[PDB]
């Protein structure tokens, strides 16, 4: 029960960082976080429903890669050819 | 099966492109979502499971309605880099799969499947589309980040990763919700529906007639298989509704003001799911899709890049055949028979009705009153003075393909009774 | 099993706190693969050892590299860029973060169950005839995901 | 299972390991010479700056790394498979072949493509 | 005076219509272009939906 609680509050933390953070690879290696809070409690009820729970996180761990590596490569993509790295400064669509 | 041609195809062609000059590959493509289309046709209504791929009455509705989106802004492209064609086609598989399944993980690996390429087909380098890009992208991330999180804690309350489990007190509550968030995000049901006016708006055209019709088909499929409380519902489809016709007064460009309605007709399809049938969805998505898919087509053909609403004025004056199909299209919206538009509102409204749920159901045809303003300030506005804008014929081709499809909207509201029997749940 | 647990789920939490919160970008990842080393512990612990090992293999090792050559790349000088009309919205997104740990607490409290099913250390014997039996679909799908990956990132970076 | 005994004793291992290090490490910290800086502040070649501004760094790099990562899933996924291996038969075989090609379709893209670019 | 009364009304009723353009504009500016905007009013609203959901 202990560690079960402790990913929901890995979870918190990781909101608690898209919110703030104000630099766009920031943001993006908080999400990494909450992926991670969330393979957590998926191992932690493997151990009461046995077995699957393995395999499922191991199956979201490659999804999580694949999300990385497709991101980030994006993010690389919009600002090499400026440098201000702040992730406002989008503001040009709103009508 | 349908599977069985796109899988292969995808592979094969990604060799390929490398041996043909860039419009053998828009050819293969086109083609290959033909045989797609066709394999699916000659299965019709027998089902084939073989475990996490599950092809069900649902799946071949949504797909079918899927593939055709995808036919269309495959068809109008022109620019080079093979990708531009290859990577339409991945994103079709991937809704493929999203639709035949019920296995969560299966279920998230391919929301990844159908949102990677299209984060990617968000650009043909325009400045804008690069905006649209990462903001899409990075609140993505996040709904994606929810349906894992809820997945995770769906396996506990239940004991499986298969939907239609059974269910209880809190937990299973509280998960049963949080699968909500992802779907819900990637169809746009308000409050959520935050990226979909600018997305629309900064994405070139021909890409946002792919995303505003079978992304959203998709989306809804693996929507329907969720269970999703009366309560949730009532939230969801009344802000839909609400910010949908109220905020679309308010802008005065093509992209965004379909972007809005997007958010409004998320909300009157998300009725039909109440009670929960494909035959009332089923419908609905068909006479949406057609009528949104004939209605983007038009805006490609004037300009790739964002038009303001005096652009649409004097399309009648330029070509006559155009400037009907493009009216007939915007009165299916609003709703309005004996256009098929009224019919798939009445059978979505005939179920929530059913199911027993008021309110809701008062609020979303009062505002579909309203949404009677912008509607005609598109759809009357082609009768008008023509202005200097571009407006670049297009083929021959197309010409013929809008044609058909404002036919077979007008068709099926006089003529309902034809498809009706045959989108059924065991068909 | 408090004495020690306790100090290692500490860790977990503490290393959290840091990710979020160190105004430059590297002394930040580097908090984060302290993170994900703890919780390869935390899952060695909990009778899934193969998970664990994965987990620095990828997570740790894989995933955050890409991390770091792309704050190299093109600078991360300050990890917290822009004081912006938005500066007011530090309290609001404490506030909400707060809300979001509640909601999730409630489902999860008072919680029962058995752990009591034995893995078996869930070693990489026991894994096979899952992981190649019925899940076998959901690989391939997984295959399929990464073949994409690989596509759409290269025409993503260099115009192909 | 197996003894949880011997990932306890991996655990020690890296507290003497990291402990002899650091050992090293403050001795030879302690002991020496000292000038305060004032002409330390530069580093090699020319007096300041090593060499010129560079601001940008070319896509190579973010392309190995990105290789890197979609392939090392790959091999996480096959480690299983390379332990029971007589218990999945030839149907095993069968879903081997499957997923390694999808991997490396990927592969051929980014090799005719190219690793400088 | 009844005439000039009819006009009126009528004036009255254009301002309700009016007023669904004011509102309307008032969800408009919402949408400002600010992502971190996005991401709270997004988190916010998630919240909602969870709050509701028992």
Known sequence: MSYLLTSALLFALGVYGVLTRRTAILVFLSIELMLNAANLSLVGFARAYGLDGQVAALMVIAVAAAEVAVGLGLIVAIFRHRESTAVDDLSELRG | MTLAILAVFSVALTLLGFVLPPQGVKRATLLGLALALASLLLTWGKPFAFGPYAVDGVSQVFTLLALLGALWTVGLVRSGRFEFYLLVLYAALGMHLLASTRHLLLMLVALEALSLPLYALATWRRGQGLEAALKYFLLGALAAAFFLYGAALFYGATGSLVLGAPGEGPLYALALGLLLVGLGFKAALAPFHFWTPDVYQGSPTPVVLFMATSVKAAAFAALLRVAAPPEALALLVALSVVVGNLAALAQKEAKRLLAYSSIAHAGYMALALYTGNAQALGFYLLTYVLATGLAFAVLSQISPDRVPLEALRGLYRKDPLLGLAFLVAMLSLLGLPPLAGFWGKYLAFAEAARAGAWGVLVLALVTSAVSAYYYLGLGLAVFARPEETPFRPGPPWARAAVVAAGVLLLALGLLPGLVLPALAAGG | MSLLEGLALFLLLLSGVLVVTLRNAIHAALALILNFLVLAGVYVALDARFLGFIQVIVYAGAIVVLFLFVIMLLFAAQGEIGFDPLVRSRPLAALLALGVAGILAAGLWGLDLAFTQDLKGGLPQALGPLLYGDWLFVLLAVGFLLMAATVVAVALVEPG | ?117 | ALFYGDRGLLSGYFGLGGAARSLGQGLARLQTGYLRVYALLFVLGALLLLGVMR
């Open chain 4, 1 to 117: 299972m197996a003894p949880i005994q011997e990932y306890v004793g991996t655990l020690i291992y890296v507290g003497v390991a990291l402990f002899i290090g650091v050992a090293a490490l403050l001795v030879g910290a302690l002991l020496g010479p000292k000038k305060p800086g004032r002409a330390k502040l530069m580093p090699y070649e020319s007096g300041n700056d090593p060499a010129g501004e560079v601001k940008r760094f070319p896509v190579h790099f973010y392309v190995v790394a990105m290789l890197f990562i979609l392939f090392d899933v790959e091999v996480a996924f096959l480690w299983p498979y390379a332990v029971s291996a007589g218990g999945l038969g030839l149907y095993g075989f069968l879903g081997v072949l499957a997923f390694t090609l999808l991997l490396f379709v990927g592969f051929l893209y980014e090799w005719w493509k190219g690793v400088m670019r």
